[PDB]
Chains A and B, each alone.
Chain A
Amino acid sequence: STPARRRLMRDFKRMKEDAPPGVSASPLPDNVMVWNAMIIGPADTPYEDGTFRLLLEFDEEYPNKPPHVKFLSEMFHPNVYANGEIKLDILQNRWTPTYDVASILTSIQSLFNDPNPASPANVEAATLFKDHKSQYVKRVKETVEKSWE
């Protein structure tokens, strides 16, 4: 069967036994092209302890094209669009076939630590991040609470 399906079972085996801290992911039972994921808000960031759910969608072009990924949880982060999609260069202009599910999620998670207000997907959020730090944190925390519920 397909290269994509083969690459994807590798990624799964990877996530099933040796998954990075604070992140997890798995296909649907009956459709390996679609995955639920979750990233936990890392410590000492305003996002701390949030449980942010994502959706990874693949097609047969994988791994020559990145998957489509978006948060299903309400987000407030300078590099996440309103529709949940993520402005991260390895998912757009700078993808290479060496990335897998594990490494995508850890690249995303690292945005929680060091956002990039230089490339804003959420302009409201980029703005607060530079000009109203206190207001920014309060918005993030609202997001944290909603992620539980």
Chain B
Amino acid sequence: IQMQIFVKTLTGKTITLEVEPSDTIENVKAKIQDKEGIPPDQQRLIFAGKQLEDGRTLSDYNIQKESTLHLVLRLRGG
């Protein structure tokens, strides 16, 4: 049970990920780290106005197939 989603920053830069509805926000942030080199602590993910918190899943936020999540970077973020 898998779907393509997109993750886009405020700059326009976009990546594509394959995920599952039951992956966690934490799992998703790790994939992003691997794919864009950004530590999960510096990532803020937004979808339909809600910011995504770890230990919740994609399906929880109703993130369905081909959805685009907005990634906001906070530097130094530490």
Interfacial chain A residues near B53, Cβ < 8 Å: 124
Number of A-B contacts (CB under 8 A): 13
Q: Is the CB of A87 within 8 A of B51?
A: no
Task: Provide the bound-state CA to CA distance between A124 and B50, in Å.
Answer: 12
Interfacial chain A residues near B77, Cβ < 8 Å: 120
Task: Provide the bound-state CA to CA distance between A127 and B41, in Å.
Answer: 12
Q: Is the CB of B78 within 8 A of A127?
A: no
Interfacial chain A residues near B78, Cβ < 8 Å: 87, 119-120
Interfacial chain A residues near B44, Cβ < 8 Å: 123, 127
Interface residues of B in 41-74 (CB under 8 A from A): 41, 44, 51, 53, 74
Interface size class of A (residues with CB under 8 A): under 10
Task: Provide the bound-state CA to CA distance between A124 and B52, in Å.
Answer: 9
Interfacial chain B residues near A127, Cβ < 8 Å: 44, 51
CB distance from B38 to the nearest CB of A (A): 13
CB distance from B15 to the nearest CB of A (A): 21
0 or 1 for each of A116-134: is its CB under 8 Å from B? (1 = yes): 0001100110010000000
Interfacial chain B residues near A119, Cβ < 8 Å: 76, 78
Interfacial chain B residues near A123, Cβ < 8 Å: 41, 44, 74
Interface residues of A in 88-136 (CB under 8 A from B): 119-120, 123-124, 127
Name A132's closest neighbour in chain B (CB-CB). B51
Task: Provide the bound-state CA to CA distance between A44 and B44, in Å.
Answer: 30
Interfacial chain A residues near B76, Cβ < 8 Å: 119
Task: Provide the bound-state CA to CA distance between A87 and B51, in Å.
Answer: 23
CB distance from A49 to the nearest CB of B (A): 27
CB distance from B30 to the nearest CB of A (A): 15
Task: Provide the bound-state CA to CA distance between A120 and B74, in Å.
Answer: 10
CB distance from B23 to the nearest CB of A (A): 19
Task: Provide the bound-state CA to CA distance between A127 and B53, in Å.
Answer: 11
**B residues at A contact (CB < 8 Å):** 41, 44, 51, 53, 74, 76-78
Can you spell out 13 A-B residue pairs with CB atoms less than 8 angstroms apart? A87-B78, A119-B76, A119-B78, A120-B41, A120-B74, A120-B77, A120-B78, A123-B41, A123-B44, A123-B74, A124-B53, A127-B44, A127-B51
